[PDB]
Amino acid sequence: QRVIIVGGGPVGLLTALGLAKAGTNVVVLEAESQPSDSPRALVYHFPVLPHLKRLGVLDDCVAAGLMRQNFAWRVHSTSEMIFWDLSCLEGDVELPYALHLGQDKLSRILIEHLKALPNVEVRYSSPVVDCEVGPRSVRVVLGGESPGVIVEGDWLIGADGANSFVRREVLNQNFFGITWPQRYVATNTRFDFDKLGFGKTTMQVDDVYGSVICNIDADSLWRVTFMEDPNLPMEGIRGRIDQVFKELLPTNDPYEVVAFSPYRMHQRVTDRMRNGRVILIGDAAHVTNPTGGLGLTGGMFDAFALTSVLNQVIHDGRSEDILDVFEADRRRKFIELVSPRASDNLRNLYHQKPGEGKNDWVNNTRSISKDIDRMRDALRFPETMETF
Amino acid sequence: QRVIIVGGGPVGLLTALGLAKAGTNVVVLEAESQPSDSPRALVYHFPVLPHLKRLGVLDDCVAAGLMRQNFAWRVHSTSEMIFWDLSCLEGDVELPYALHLGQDKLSRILIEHLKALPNVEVRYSSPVVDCEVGPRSVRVVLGGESPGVIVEGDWLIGADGANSFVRREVLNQNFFGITWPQRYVATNTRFDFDKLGFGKTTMQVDDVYGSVICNIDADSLWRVTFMEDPNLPMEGIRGRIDQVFKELLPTNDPYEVVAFSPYRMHQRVTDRMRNGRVILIGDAAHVTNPTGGLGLTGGMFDAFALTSVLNQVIHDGRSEDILDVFEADRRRKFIELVSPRASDNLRNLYHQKPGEGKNDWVNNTRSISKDIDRMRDALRFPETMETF
């Protein structure tokens, strides 16, 4: 019973590895020729880490990335830093840390691990040019560097991103929701935030210069974001980065813009995450704005829950109806917990103009920071996103 | 081809009348003893009115209620009144009015017109307690003042409200979304807003004493709302109404609380509004908070869209696939247009604390008031909720 995974990013590769370690025969197909290194979420929150450890990749991730416990809110109007700290979870959770690691680097580690499994085949530069899906079988034909090759399987997993071929073309499913008005500008910028006392993740609150400032690697490379009007012409964007940064950055110290990418953000979910032998996970199933990194976290919990349930269907003869239970719970988490939380995150970080509301928000954030019970409760949210 | 409608509110009765006028055999079954007069939305916006005229009940609505064009935003902190006026649509819509009429009074007019059509039966106090659904027929068994009665048909339409038997028990569909944190308290209050210059609908903007103030009849009965923390005991609500009205109402003039009811408010939608021979419409399909009356309006556009398509199925032999188009478009309207707009309506009306954001809001609202084309564009939103 071969499983075909369309999508060569973390969600698809984590699913590959979990399925493969159970003896499942797996074929991963990615259209692009390598994992994307574009500026996207890069933090693996505490409840994800036991799953990475179980899969045997956490130690390599730690070697390649970094672990931290500190987190800072920075009020731009006053320069006040307010620290929260995951060490308040030290007896409550197995791994009370946050891991910083680019998704491209996690993907390479996953690929090296899949090589060790002879039951898994990985094919980059191999887009799907046609797909027919039956009640009991699936069939794709490849292009790119795999011309005309035919791949047949028992299950098709759509793990191929916001613009999913599988969701749109194979299933012809909807993707209803909203698109935020503002353009999201995500940069990787070299700037010494560490000497200025910043949290390894620092969330800058403002109505013009709100930003997620998040450490990428040890060469002082940091994620730095901001919002702008999507009507501002695309050709001027690099110049506008400089103009924004003159006020967004905390000093006039030198910086290098290493990479930048403008995005539109969405709160969208598909009608159904399972439809016969076809399943959708990650951004192919649902998209959130990335404030708080909850799209990445949700996609990984998609991967872990599907791995558990599909391994049981294939190896333990479990009834396929468990897949319907799976898909509904994964939509329930996204619609009822993740999407509202991420939306509140975006609004609180980027859109509070001066007034009573903002002052109340800051006073409350400061109070949580001095009350371990409220801090624990604030910090614990990602654990609620996992399906059991 | 008999159609069974579960639900005796305006959505169900409107669908009944449209189907019946084309010769459809219809059975309507309402659990309760008579149409609800609980305080709910009561305004029928301009794009609903041509459909009420087409069905021939608009005349009885006008006689029973009131038509108006004026609309006011009131800033509680400054007592500023800012008026928008529907007569700026005089040239572009055929009925540039807003109709105020209690839904119970609407339902009673629809009951009278349904009596004239022998091909419809309207059974009240007849809750459905069991149901069997087949690939090509449906059957229900009634409780209430019709016990053991068996009703068979070719179609089942669930129009039975937010806690729908048809959605939950017949289809076992989900109702994913969010519940707002505050208790909504909708009063019918006798108070002379007319002599103070209020708009027939007035929306009072505040972070504590926000309120929808909307005229119900000609005896100075008005809808007056407010939000409160739902952890307050249900038992002391009448005393709290008096405390709130001390500062909410614009003067110290006398008032009479005639009726009130507390609600929790939701933004939720089911997985599909059509599944075989079962269709969901109105609050059984999707629920929004009532700020701006978009739930009533969307439910009515459910009925008008379903009537047109389903009449084509039964009498013109159109392919049943038109229902798949219908259901997706109705979900698209709710998810992408109505629920985001109503949600912004609520936040803008009841939660804007003093600050730059609220001052910006007021200045924009006032600028729209002096720009006939911007006011035209602001007022026009409900026409986009209609399915074609």
For B89, list phi and psi in degrees, rounded to 5: -105, 0
Using alpha carbons, select from B313, B23, B174, B243 the residue that is nearest to residue A334: B174
Tell me whether residue A98 is annotated as binding.
no
* End-to-end CA separation in angstroms for chain A: 25
Tell me whether residue B216 is annotated as binding.
no
- B176, B328, B336 member nearest A177 (Cβ): B336
Structure determination method: X-ray
**Mind telling me how many Å the CA of A247 is from chain B's nearest CA?**
20
- B272, B335, B354 member nearest A177 (Cβ): B335
What is the distance between the alpha carbons of residues A3 and B87, in angstroms, rounded to a whole number? 62
Q: Are strands A120-123 and A26-29 parallel, antiparallel or unpaired?
A: parallel
Using alpha carbons, select from B251, B132, B263 the residue that is nearest to residue B197: B251
For chain B, the domain total comes to 1
**Would you call B355 and A360 a contact, using CB atoms and an 8 Å cutoff?**
no
Token reading at B113: 């017109």
Token reading at B39: 């305080």
Helical packing angle, B339-350 and B294-316, nearest 10°: 170
List CB contacts (< 8 A) between B177 and chain A: 335-336
List CB contacts (< 8 A) between B360 and chain A: 353
**Mind telling me how many Å the CA of B310 is from chain A's nearest CA?**
23
Domain that holds residue A29: 1-388
Contact indicator for B304, B50 with CB cutoff of 8 Å: no
Using alpha carbons, select from B58, B352, B16, B268 the residue that is nearest to residue B157: B16
| Residues of A engaging B, defined by a Cβ cutoff of 8 Å | 174, 176-178, 207, 271-272, 328, 331-332, 335-336, 340, 352-358, 360
CA max distance for chain B: 63
Nearest CA in chain A to B333: A176
From residue A74, give the alpha-carbon distance in Å to each of A218, A224, A349, A362: 22, 13, 10, 10
